Structure 1
Amino acid sequence: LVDRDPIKTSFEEWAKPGHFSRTIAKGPDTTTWIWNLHADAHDFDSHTSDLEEISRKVFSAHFGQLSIIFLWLSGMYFHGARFSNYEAWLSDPTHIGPSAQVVWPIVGQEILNGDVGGGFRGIQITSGFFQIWRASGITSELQLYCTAIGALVFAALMLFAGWFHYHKAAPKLAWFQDVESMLNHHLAGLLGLGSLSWAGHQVHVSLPINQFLNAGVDPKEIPLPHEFILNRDLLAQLYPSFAEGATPFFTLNWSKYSEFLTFRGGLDPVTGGLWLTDIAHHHLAIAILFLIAGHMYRTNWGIGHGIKDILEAHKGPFTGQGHKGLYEILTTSWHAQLSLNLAMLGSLTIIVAHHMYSMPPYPYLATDYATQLSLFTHHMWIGGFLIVGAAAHAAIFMVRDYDPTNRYNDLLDRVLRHRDAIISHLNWVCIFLGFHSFGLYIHNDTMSALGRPQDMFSDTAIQLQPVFAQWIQNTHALAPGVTAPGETASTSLTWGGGELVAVGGKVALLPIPLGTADFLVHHIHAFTIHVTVLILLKGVLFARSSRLIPDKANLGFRFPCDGPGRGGTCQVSAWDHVFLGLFWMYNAISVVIFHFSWKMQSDVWGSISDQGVVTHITGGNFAQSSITINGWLRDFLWAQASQVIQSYGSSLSAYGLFFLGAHFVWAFSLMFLFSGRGYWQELIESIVWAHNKLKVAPATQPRALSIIQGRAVGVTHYLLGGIATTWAFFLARIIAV
């Protein structure tokens, strides 16, 4: 199912911009043509109506994405070998700050090459690559150079594959629609075999090298990874069970492998991370489970399941026919699959962000506060963006590919017939949550201002205790020995076990208390999430029609309005709902990251002394100061911003410059959001007049930006400015202290 040489390789189409569209290829009468060229670059569905060609175009771009990712990985690995102090950091991870970037001295920018330890001058990095390299057994820079070379080779291979599968042998449509085979392969081979290979690498390389490192041996005296394979005596000395070979595995005497395959739980006191034996056992079990899961769906040999057969058998007295017809929708529309995958990926990213901080998987990662904060905020933002994109593409599918005549589905029909109740109930829930979550903050502020601290919602006057979460913490703290007999310690130290882990005089992790403030902040999170969901679902559900504009589907997915009639019809399209929900996503993620930062700085992170007294960074003021808006403004925003505003003249002045630059970018966006196109089109007419006077009027007539373009520019600049401000503030605050 491939075609030989579908499209000739030529430079002819390079010299004719806009060849993908008939209208754009005509020529640039005005300046709107240039903007329209870029906005429709990757909309393959608008270029042609053939599903096979769209699938072939989609298949090739992923190869370019993979090549770009491989180039990025190659650069990251190469910079750590040539412009880094990784070897010096390896001998003292607790007193040296990782750095992998140096700057050329031209205009006085060499001040950014601050001292970081190990006789090195550079920029301190917070991506956590040093911990990953240490956990993999990497010791010298030659291995990093080899990894960079391999990544370059893989990027070249990906680029060649991308060219080949589009210009020499393009698969047919019947190849793409083999969902059962694709699922079987991506489950058994992509995931299970990868987990098995990583488990093997961890067993044979990471474990002995990491044990030698934790023993305190000089990294230059540790035997090379290949010495543990050729010389089984070394492994037998390290692990006696290796002397028996693979015989216990094939005789089901798996108890002999308990030395390097454990079920301990908790953190390693030496490094502050999870035990590597637990990780190896976890990867082995996950590989087995994924290998089993990949033999469910039917193929050329009869045995297995048919996804259509599974779907068609589920229906209920409330839902009618049920899931019949969903198989044909998901195997014919690219947008629905994209929306579902984007939503699932965003949720998974948020879950990963939440899980990484409380269960540190890398050595010397819990005590690196900047890395933890950066990873948390980065992954949360990525998850939010993916979640928004899911709804955007769901609306796109609803507008374009919906067709009840040939693709009828009962479940989709029933949802669209009672959307008013869903929207009204969601509106009521949002209003109730906003009143009963944010209103308690204003009450506390008013009572504090009036001089009545005894009438506030606080731990000392009127308690609002999160009794349900405390019960979960108590249950999980008592899990070992009762409901998890095979475990020695709890999964996390934050459950409330009472034990504290200190590495290098710093607090890695300890139980986290929950009080009245956590109740309020959690309900604030719920309120913001509910409002965002309301906006996106209202946008998706009313994409085709409404009581105001019955024929909204004919106007398309991205149109500005339908005139000033009916009192005003501004921003009625589904695109405008995504444009509006991006702001609320930004708001929710900012509140969440502020909560995380303040809570960790106030109740977890700190230093321990010889007598064992913990002194936190901010002194534990979160409980009594976060219950008012004035407290958030004073003890968090005003107090913690002194690091970034006093960074001039030092190696951290770049963050100080980025603070003001992001301020300017954020403030600059309000011009596009608060104004309209007619004023700017009328203003241009006067500017064109004087150019005509001096014979400098261009033939490409200048036109003001369209309404949609202006809204997009405004939202983009707004988001960029806000995120850059928060990034600069966080990094400047956390690197110094």
Structure 2
Amino acid sequence: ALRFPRFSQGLAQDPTTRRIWFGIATAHDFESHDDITEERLYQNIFASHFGQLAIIFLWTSGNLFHVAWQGNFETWVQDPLHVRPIAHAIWDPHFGQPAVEAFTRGGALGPVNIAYSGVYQWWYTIGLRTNEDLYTGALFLLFLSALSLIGGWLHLQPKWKPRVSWFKNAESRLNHHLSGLFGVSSLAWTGHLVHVAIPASRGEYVRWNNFLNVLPHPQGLGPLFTGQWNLYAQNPDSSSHLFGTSQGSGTAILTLLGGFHPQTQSLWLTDMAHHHLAIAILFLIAGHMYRTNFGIGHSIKDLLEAHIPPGGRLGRGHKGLYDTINNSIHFQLGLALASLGVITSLVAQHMYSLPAYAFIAQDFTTQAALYTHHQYIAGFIMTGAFAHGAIFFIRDYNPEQNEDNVLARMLDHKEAIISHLSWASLFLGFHTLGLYVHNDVMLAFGTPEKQILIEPIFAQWIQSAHGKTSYGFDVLLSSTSGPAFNAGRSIWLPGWLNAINENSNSLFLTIGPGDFLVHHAIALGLHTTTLILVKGALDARGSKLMPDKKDFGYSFPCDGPGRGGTCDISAWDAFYLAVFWMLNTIGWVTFYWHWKHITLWQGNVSQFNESSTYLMGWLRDYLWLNSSQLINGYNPFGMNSLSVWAWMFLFGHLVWATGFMFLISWRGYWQELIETLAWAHERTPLANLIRWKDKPVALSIVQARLVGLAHFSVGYIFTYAAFLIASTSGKFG
């Protein structure tokens, strides 16, 4: 490698300008780099993870630093319900004085941006009641970033260079990560919540100078060693507690009273403490499972070779799977992104319903921004999980070493899987679109009594199976005589019932036929994204149209116009079209969320329950109506604080349309156009003196696909962020 890509001499030996793009895009595809090994692969991955941790700690330190320096956090602590958060100040020298005047919020002497990230609520719930606290945290996270950087530097040096036999130690790694990185980590978080966050909620500030003296509980560790743990749940902040002062506070540190804090409409800090403690016990116990240097424990290899069902249904079972996962980094990455995306969606689905931060339920833009954020993140992470499974099936899947096992016996009936997922998506799309269209028509014919309104009896049954008496099923928690209600009758169910039955909060919302129909739209989206991704992953090795697809790799443009045509045949293109369907699905999810919640917050749940059953309600009563205060962010006569969100709205529209250029138009019209341009530049006087060094070419097909999707997704995300933030901030209900 001679030119800029030092990691691929095939792109360095490219006189065109494709090598710049492909040296950007393959920079982090180490197992495709030239003249490397498995040692160097894992070591570069390890140093890269160090860099990622450094960036994460640096970005958190930037958040803390800007909230401390340019924020109003000390003012937000006093009157949080009526003082606006501040992400960071703004020095944009293009600003006009109306814009300097409009962006001055939260009691600031200059322009500012309102923190729609909820970091204020989460820092205030865990202590951190001064700017100096955030400054110390930011400086410590900067130290941690430098620590990660030096660690990743030295672990690249030959003296500290772990071998592949160390990375593949999938039992010591699992034991350590489970026990320490989850159990001890959540245990330390409890040791913060018990020593700092609860005392900071109960009044007194417990800081590094005085945290050894302050007893978290008036009887310190006697109750714990003597087994009398119930002494830690004696005075559980009996319903009159003001978060941040001793009025109506107590002395408990670990409780299971459940439900919400009445002031904050959030979860109790004692519940979080006991929670992280209990799951710490579970993870510290589970991290002593796998065999290590001490003679006891399990070998995952024999756990998999033992889970082969007699009967040959699964065939060879999980035999040879430890070796095909531990050697395959893409399999580890795919499983990891699967779990991560599911738990990210879980974070969203449980932070909207069970907010664990003070005064985040009552503020309404952060609760939407976070949900939308984590759900789009989960959709991307899930698409990536499947894409890396496809990359595994091409690159690291050895069909001989896992013959007739659960994963080759999987690839056998790929046609069955693809066909039945196709059936599910076809069925759902047909039917639910038909019902939305029937209702659109029945409203268009002035006959809303003829609409197909299916009450979601099953979700309403689960709701009534948790204590919601809004339907009258009276089963397993709404029935007082049920043994499930009798078991936890004295533990959590009073708080949980006065929470779930309270129709102001956002857990277990009262759902109706529109919720049914949009849940089926969601199922269509999930099944279809899954179809696209699974089909790409299983046809990654080959199909009837291109059986030697494993030899062309994961990302290749096509196979030519022969055999009828092979546009978008690669598993990369399955990922591609799945990102489209994923954005669509998460858009449905977040549209449903934002409309249900903005109608709840405004008070008119009837708006959703009547208008969500026909698509013109979404186009009128959600998009057209809630975009009223946004697009008026800057009129011909003046502007307001929502000018930035309107500009971002239109910016996202613009790139979302620009992506259609790279998607609709493909390579050949642009190559010819660039040939004309090159002629003109080489025959235009006073510019003949200037000659390019990289011969200009139109973007490669796979590249331009990626670029179109980048513009498309950036526009999707920025547009909906603008709209969501501006609609929920233009009113705050």
TM-score of the superposed pair, with normalisation by structure 2: 0.89
Q: 1:484 aligns with which of 488, 499, 517?
A: 488
1:473-552 matches, within 5 Å, as: 473-477=463-467, 478=477, 481-489=485-493, 496-497=500-501, 499=502, 507-509=504-506, 512-552=509-549
Aligned to 2:365: 370
Counterparts in 2 of 1:228 and 1:157: CA distance versus 1, 3 Å: closer
Distance 1:619 1:331, change over 3 A: closer
| Aligned mate of 1:225, from 198, 207, 211 | 207
Indicate the residue corresponding to 2:222 in structure 1. Answer: 247
Inter-partner Cα distance in structure 1 for 2:704 and 2:552: 19
Match of 1:632 among 615, 618, 626: 618
Matches within 5 A, 1:560-599: 560-599=557-596
Q: Distance in 2 between matches of 1:224 and 1:469?
A: 44
| 2:184 counterpart (180, 193, 197) | 193
| Equivalent AA in structure 1 for residue 486 of structure 2 | V
Aligned pair partner of 2:398 in 403, 410, 421:
403
3-state secondary structure, aligned to 1:665: helix
Alpha-carbon distance in 2 for matches of 1:46, 1:119: 52
Q: Which residue of 2 aligns with 1:203?
A: 194
Mapped partners of 2:457, 2:499: distance in 1: 14
2:716 match: 722
The amino acid of 1:485's aligned partner reads R
Are the structure 2 counterparts of residues 358 and 493 from structure 1 closer, same or farther at C-alpha, using a change threshold of 3 Å? farther
Q: Which of 280, 288, 294 is 1:287 aligned to? A: 280
Output the amino acid matched with 1:662: G
Check the 8 A contact 1:688/1:697 in 2, yes or no.
Answer: no
1:116 to 101, 105, 111: 105
Question: C-alpha root-mean-square deviation of aligned residues, in Å?
Answer: 2.2
CA distance 1:321–1:99, shift in 2 (3 Å): same
Q: What SS does the aligned partner of 1:244 have?
A: coil
Structure 1 Cα separation of the partners of residues 391 and 315 of structure 2: 26
Give, as a single letter, the amino acid of the residue that structure 2 aligns with 1:253.
Q
Which residue is 1:334 aligned to? Answer: 329
Deviation at 1:231, TM superposition (A): 4.9
**AA matched with 2:42:** S
User: What is the match of residue 4 of structure 1?
Assistant: none
Alpha-carbon shift at residue 86 of structure 1 (Å): 0.8
Give the residue type in structure 2 aligned to 1:674. I
Q: Distance in 1 between matches of 2:301 and 2:106?
A: 61
Q: 1:79 aligns with which of 66, 90, 103?
A: 66
Using a 3 Å threshold, how does the CA distance of structure 1 residues 300 and 678 change in structure 2: closer, same or farther? same
Name the CA shift for 1:711/1:418 in 2 (closer, same or farther; >3 Å).
Answer: same
Aligned to 1:683: 673
Using the TM superposition, give the Cα deviation of residue 118 of structure 1 relative to its aligned residue in structure 2, in angstroms: 3.9
1:605 partner amino acid: W
User: What CA distance in whole angstroms lies between the structure 1 residues aligned with 2:451 and 2:393?
Assistant: 48
Return the offset for 1:100: 3.3
**In the TM superposition, what is the alpha-carbon distance from 1:537 to its structure 2 partner?**
0.9
What does residue 472 of structure 1 align with? 462
Q: 2:702 aligned to 689, 708, 733, which one?
A: 708
- CA change 1:243–1:349 in 2 (3 A) is closer
Change (3 A) 1:493 1:593: farther
Q: How does 1:97-246 map to 2 (within 5 A)?
A: 97-104=84-91, 106-109=93-96, 111-112=99-100, 114-118=103-107, 121=110, 122-168=112-158, 169-212=160-203, 222=204, 225=207, 229=211, 231=213, 242-246=217-221
What amino acid does structure 1 have at the position aligned with 2:291? R
Aligned CA distance change for structure 1 residues 165 and 522 (closer, same or farther; 3 Å): same
Provide closer, same or farther for how the CA distance between residues 230 and 56 of structure 1 changes in structure 2, counting only shifts above 3 A. closer
2-side partners of 1:226 and 1:453: how far apart? 64
- Contact preservation (8 Å) 1:672, 1:713: yes
Q: Secondary structure at the match of 2:113?
A: strand
Deviations 1:7-27 (A, max 9, x none): xxxxxx9x952222222334x
Contact kept in structure 2, 1:89 and 1:118, CA below 8 Å: no
- AA of the residue aligned to 2:47: S
Note the C-alpha offset of 1:409.
5.2
Secondary structure of the residue that 2:15 maps to in structure 1?
coil
Evaluate the alpha carbon distance shift between residue 440 and residue 158 of structure 1 in structure 2; reply closer, same or farther with a 3 A threshold: same
- The letter for the 2-side match of 1:707 is I
- Report which stretch shifted further, 171-180 or 370-379: 171-180
Distance 1:107 1:301, change over 3 A: closer
Distance in 2 between the 1:517 and 1:681 partners? 49
The residue type equivalent to 2:231 in the other structure is K
Contact persistence 1:494–1:510 (CA under 8 A): no
Aligned-pair distance for 1:105?
6.2
1:422 Cα deviation after fit: 2.1
Tell me what 1:504 maps to.
none
Kept after mapping to 2: 8 A contact 1:83/1:102 = yes
Q: Deviations over 1:660-701 (max 9, x none)?
A: 222211112222111221211112222222222232443532
What letter is aligned with 1:296? M
Match of 1:6 in 2: none
Residue by residue over 1:478-519, the C-alpha shift from the partner in whole angstroms, topping out at 9 and shown as x without a partner, is: 27842413424367569853x35xxxxxx5457622222211
* Range 550-559 or range 652-661, more displaced: 550-559
Task: Please give the secondary structure, in 2, of the residue aligned with 1:99.
Answer: coil
Query: 1:19-58 to 2 correspondence within 5 Å?
Result: 19-26=6-13, 28-47=14-33, 48=35, 50-58=37-45
1:42–1:520 Cα change, 3 Å? same
- Other-structure match for 1:609: none
Matched with 1:313 is 306
1:246-297 Cα distance to aligned partner (Å, 9 max, x none): 2232222222222312211111112221111111111221211111111111
The answer on whether the counterparts of 1:495 and 1:511 sit within 8 Å (CA) in structure 2 is no
| Cα gap change, 1:125 to 1:16, in 2 (>3 Å) | same
Counterparts of 1:601 and 1:521, CA distance in 2? 16
What corresponds to 1:63 in structure 2?
Answer: 50
In 2 relative to 1, CA 292–538 (structure 1 residues): closer, same or farther, beyond 3 Å?
same
Q: 1 CA distance for matches of 2:727 and 2:430?
A: 33
Pick which of 244-253 and 482-491 moved more.
482-491
Question: Normalising to structure 1: TM-score of the pair?
Answer: 0.89
Q: Which segment is superposed worse, 478-487 or 689-698?
A: 478-487
Unaligned runs of 5+ in 2: 235-251, 468-476, 479-483
Q: Do the aligned partners of 1:95 and 1:117 also contact (CA within 8 Å) in 2?
A: no
Q: Structure 2: which amino acid aligns with 1:248?
A: P
Q: CA separation in 2, counterparts of 1:172 and 1:117?
A: 54
1:612 maps to what in 2? none
Report the equivalent of 2:607: 621
CA distance in 2, matches of 1:105, 1:403: 55
Whole-angstrom CA distance in 2 between matches of 1:327 and 1:731? 46
Cα displacement string for residues 602-660 of structure 1 (whole angstroms, at most 9, x for unaligned residues): 1x324xxxxxxxxx1x5631111121122211111111111111111122211111122
